[PDB]
Structures are given as C-alpha cells and as structure tokens.
Amino acid sequence: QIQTNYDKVVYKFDDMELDENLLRGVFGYGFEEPSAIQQRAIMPIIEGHDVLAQAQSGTGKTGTFSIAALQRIDTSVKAPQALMLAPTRELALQIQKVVMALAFHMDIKVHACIGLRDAQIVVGTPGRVFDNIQRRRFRTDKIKMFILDEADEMLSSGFKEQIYQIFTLLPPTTQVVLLSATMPNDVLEVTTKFMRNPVRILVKKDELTLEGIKQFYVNVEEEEYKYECLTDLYDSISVTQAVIFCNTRRKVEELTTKLRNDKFTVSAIYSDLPQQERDTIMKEFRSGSSRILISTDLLARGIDVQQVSLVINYDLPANKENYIHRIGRKGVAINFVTNEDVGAMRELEKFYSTQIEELPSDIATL
C-alpha cells in the first residue's frame, strides 16, 4: 500500500480543459462525472507527470489514462505517440474499445498488438509489443507516453523481461503511467527504476454499510412457502429491477426456471460460470433486458449493487459475514426467514447491530 502525495482534485470534466471532440467522446460514452481516480489522476498525466496509481478494477482506471492520453495526442503526427500495455489480449481489446469510443469524434487511429506504424495509439500485451519493436514493425521514436495497466498481473504472468526491454527501447523522456491493484516488491522495483518522482495516488475501496438501506423480513415459516411469498410480493409492490440471493447454485437455477414458468424474465449467475459469462449476464441485466437477477453468495463480493431498488435474500446466508456484501452501500432489503431461520436472523441482528423490522403492509408507498 503506497501513500498519496498529490492533493489536486478536479470534480468536473468541464474543469479539465479537454478538447471538445474528446469531451464529446467521454459524454457520448456514458461518463457524466469523473470517478475517484479520474478526479485525481487525469490532470497530472496530462501535465506530463509520472503517475503511480494503486487502484482496483471498476474504479475508472481505463477511463483515466485513456482520456488523458487522447488529450495529449497530436492529430498531426501520424505515428505511435502513446503505448498502452496489458497482461492479456482480452484486456487489451477492451482498452482499445474504450479508447476508440472516447475518440469517436477525433481523428485518432488506435491499433491492437497481439500496418501499425501509422497508428497514433498502440494497445497490446508485453510479449507481442516487444516482438514488434524488435522486428522494426512499429515506430517508437514518437512515443511520449507509456502506460502499464495492471502491472502486478503483467509481472505475475512472466512479462518482467519484456517490460524491462520496452522501457529501454522507448525515448528516455517517455512519460510513465503505472496502475496496479497491488504494489508488491516486483512492481515497486519497476517503479523505483523506471519512474521519475511519480505522482503517487491510492484509491481505497469504499466501505460498505447498512445505513443507506431499509431492511425488512418475512416469516415464511416453512421452506415450501418461500416461492409463494415471492410471487405474492410482486402483486403488492411495483418493482423496476431486483436481485435475489440463494446459498446454493441448485436453488439459484431451480428458482430461475420456476420464475420463467410464471413469465418472469430472470438472469442467473453462480460460481462455475466463467468470468466472461457472468460479466455479460450482468451487463445485459443492468441494461434492462431482464428484470430479476438470481445470484449465489460466493459472487456477492465481485458483484455490482447499482440503482437496483430491491434486494431479496430468498435464502439466509450460511456465513453471517456475507450479509453486507449482499445489501451494502438507498434501497430496500427483504429477507425470507423460516421457523428455523429465526435464530439465524438473530445472528445477523447482533453481528451488524442493525434492526430488521417485519415487512409491513405499507410497502407500496415505501
């Protein structure tokens, strides 16, 4: 864990002095307000500083270095001016998509590396990018910005040598931006050796609380009645979208097919599914395709609690710890408790020192 040493926060993109074409790109992509990182890291990068950012995924990392890079790009020069590096080609392609999107209104060619001596931005993996430099495939003399995304992952995937080489093959004055979720010995060595008086930024994941959501429960009494109460709950209150939790994959899939029989539109995620799959499921769900998402408890950590108004714990988490990851933060949480789940809900009662009032009849308003 590195310490922050740069106290300059810009809250609006409007105050970043970006070019209209670029500013149009970011807006016309979804971004409306800069995230934590983007508020602190974008400006220094544009200003030419070396930036060492310790940041987790889904904080706006890709948007941070992509926006700052495009701003620095000279539309006149038709050669590689910035190199973006990633551990995998999948991650490299994603970066390229985002970069291309933000640059929809600009005249900037983005090429992937896994006819690239005329592109103004190169994205690729360490192994491939190195081989291309050695083969004199892409011009490096115009490179002024070198971005290493997820350095910890690149080093753990045996790209040390490759990366080190790249450093020595670029113009000695090349600005270095390095982002990484963790800062191990390996990564810090790169930092010390290849970076000059870096702007050190650290974005801590926001702590979760229950204070933002109103939580209730429903004594279904017996397990056989859980589904009954669920369907009846959709007769009582109006719902935009909801997320349902179960302990096992089996129940997740069983509840899923049952709901589909009653003409519900549901998405289901569990552990055995590839990250690729889950990601799509959640993306299409958060876009409005489906209106119900059933998930197992294991993936309550790497899950996103968007503006989904309602969360239902069909099952009661075997591990008390997992209650926060289910309903943590403005929303509503309704728990399904049986006669034997009473003592279980008591555990959650004392553990978080919170209160779970029984579901009133006045919910249509609430």
Binding site: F13, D232, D262, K263, P360, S361
Partner: protein, 240 residues
Amino acid sequence: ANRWVPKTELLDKDEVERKMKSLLNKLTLEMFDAISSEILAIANISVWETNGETLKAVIEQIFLKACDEPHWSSMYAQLCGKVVKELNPDITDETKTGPKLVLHYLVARCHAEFDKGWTDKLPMSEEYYAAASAKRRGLGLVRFIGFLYRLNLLTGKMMFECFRRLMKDLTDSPSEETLESVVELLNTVGEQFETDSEGSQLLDSLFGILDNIIQTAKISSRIKFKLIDIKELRHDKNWN
C-alpha cells in the same frame, strides 16, 4: 402488528390492481407477447360492464407504470398499441367502441395525469421527497407521451400542450433534468411533429429558446452538447 400477509372470470378493483402490478412488473421485451396478451385479457373484461370501468383502470395503471419507469416508456407504449389494436370490439362504454374507445381513453388519461402538473425548480428532506417525485413522474409522463405520439396513439393537440408546458418552464432558468427531457423528446418525436395541425412554427420558437439558453445560460458542457446536436440535427441534417 399491522403487517404484510401472502395468501368466465370477473375481477374487483383490488384483484385488478394486484394482477396488473404483477403483469406490469414482468413486462420485458422477451416476455412481451405473452404478458401483453394476459393484460389484454383483463382489459376485455369490460365486455361485461356498462361504463367500461375495468378497462379505464388498466389504462390508468399502465400510465402510472410508464411514469415511474421511463427506461421502459417505449415498451409500455407498445403495450398500449396492442390494447388499442386487439381490444374486443364488442366493448361498450356508457360515456365509440373497440379501438376508437381506447384511443380516447389514452388521451383522457393523459389530460388527467398532465393537469396534476409539477414544478421544475425543486428546493434530504420531508415533502421534498414528494415534490421531487412529482417532477420525476411528470417528466416521465412527457416521455411516455412521446412514445405514444410516435405510434400515432395520440393526436397533435396533446403534443402541443406538452411542448407548451415544457417551453413555459424552459424560459425560467430550466433545470438540467428539464433540458434533458426536451432533447430526448425532440429525438423521439421531433421529425414527425414537424408536420401537424402550426407545428413546425412551434419548433421554431422552441429552438429559439434553446439558441438563447446555449449562448447565455450556465449549463454543464454535457447538456450544451446535447442542445447543439439537436439544433444541428433539425436545422442542418434535417432529421437525416
């Protein structure tokens, strides 16, 4: 303790509301035809009614839905398109039959919801949570009107009244939510509305107010781009 408890054909007020909540809660692009047909089965109950009271309620709840969930306004609008098109022609109301009846219902339900009105400039808090929702549901409505208008389920007179209300609230230091609503409405209905029973000349006054709000008002860059784009879309590109 006052709590919550679980549990050819006719249905009372409650049974109608409960079944409609569930059905409008299930409405997706995937399960559309299946759920919209069951909703139609509830609207067809009015064949056994004098003043078509049940059908009136179905239209009401759909509007209420479309106003609380703007993300699906276009879909709810198509649900109305189906009800109008596939309604039982034998349905009589003691106050026109078949489709022509539902069209009038839609219009009436608009006027009703619209007359409720709302304010743009909003003062956590108490009544503030209500006045903020009134605006949200108000703007949710103006959006729903657009999707109904595009499907030709509403006449121009209602669209005029809609722009009318937005313009009056567009010359009094408009909020960004209002500007957002007007842009989206113009992207949905703009071209079509260009010709309708004095219509294009209404957009002239509207776009004029925008030119002013672009060159003087203190608005975010994001909003300023949206306004500039639709200005070019109409004037230069001509909706093409």
